[PDB]
Ligand binder design. Structure first.
Ligand SMILES: [Cl-]
Ligand SMILES: [Cl-]
Lengths: 98, 98
């Protein structure tokens, strides 16, 4: 119930290999934060520059705290230098297997 | 690896309760298909009409075979009566924890 899922859709403008390298360090940063549960970076099949990240947090407060960390800035900056994003925060309604 | 992840973004134009009920039946239909791994239906926080579904399949062929089932067609008809959607098929690039 409390758990939140942040979903980002990226359009990569720069080199996808550089994007992935930057994202790996971004994810490691977030993995150091209290409340981090898991993440998966997905790449669209047959597209080169289309990515979706799914990140799970114990609660909304922990997610907001992570974004507000001073340590996030270089990662946020490096990501924005390479891509644009459309994103939203979600709660789970249904899961299978149950 | 071989796993594929299908991501759907729904904009619901009917009643959300009816959408969730019809979606549950469609999800059950896919859950019976060979190669189905898991799915999660997510609802955007502070919104009534925005959902994202994430579904994992063992491989691309299993996903294709499921989509091609004649039984899918009336399910699709019912779900699309209540919602529009934008979707894509993805491969996992990074996951934490490892
Ligand atoms: Cl800046
Ligand atoms: Cl069938």
């Amino acid at each position: 119930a409390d758990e939140v899922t942040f979903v980002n859709r990226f359009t990569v403008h720069g080199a996808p290999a550089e994007f992935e390298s930057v994202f790996a360090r971004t994810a490691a940063f977030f993995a150091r934060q209290p409340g981090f549960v898991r993440h998966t970076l997905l790449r669209e099949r047959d597209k080169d520059n289309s990515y979706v990240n799914i990140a799970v947090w114990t609660d909304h407060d922990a997610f907001r705290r992570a974004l507000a960390q001073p340590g996030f800035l270089p990662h946020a900056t490096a990501l924005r230098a390479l891509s644009t994003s459309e994103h939203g925060l979600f709660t789970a309604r249904q899961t299978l297997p149950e």
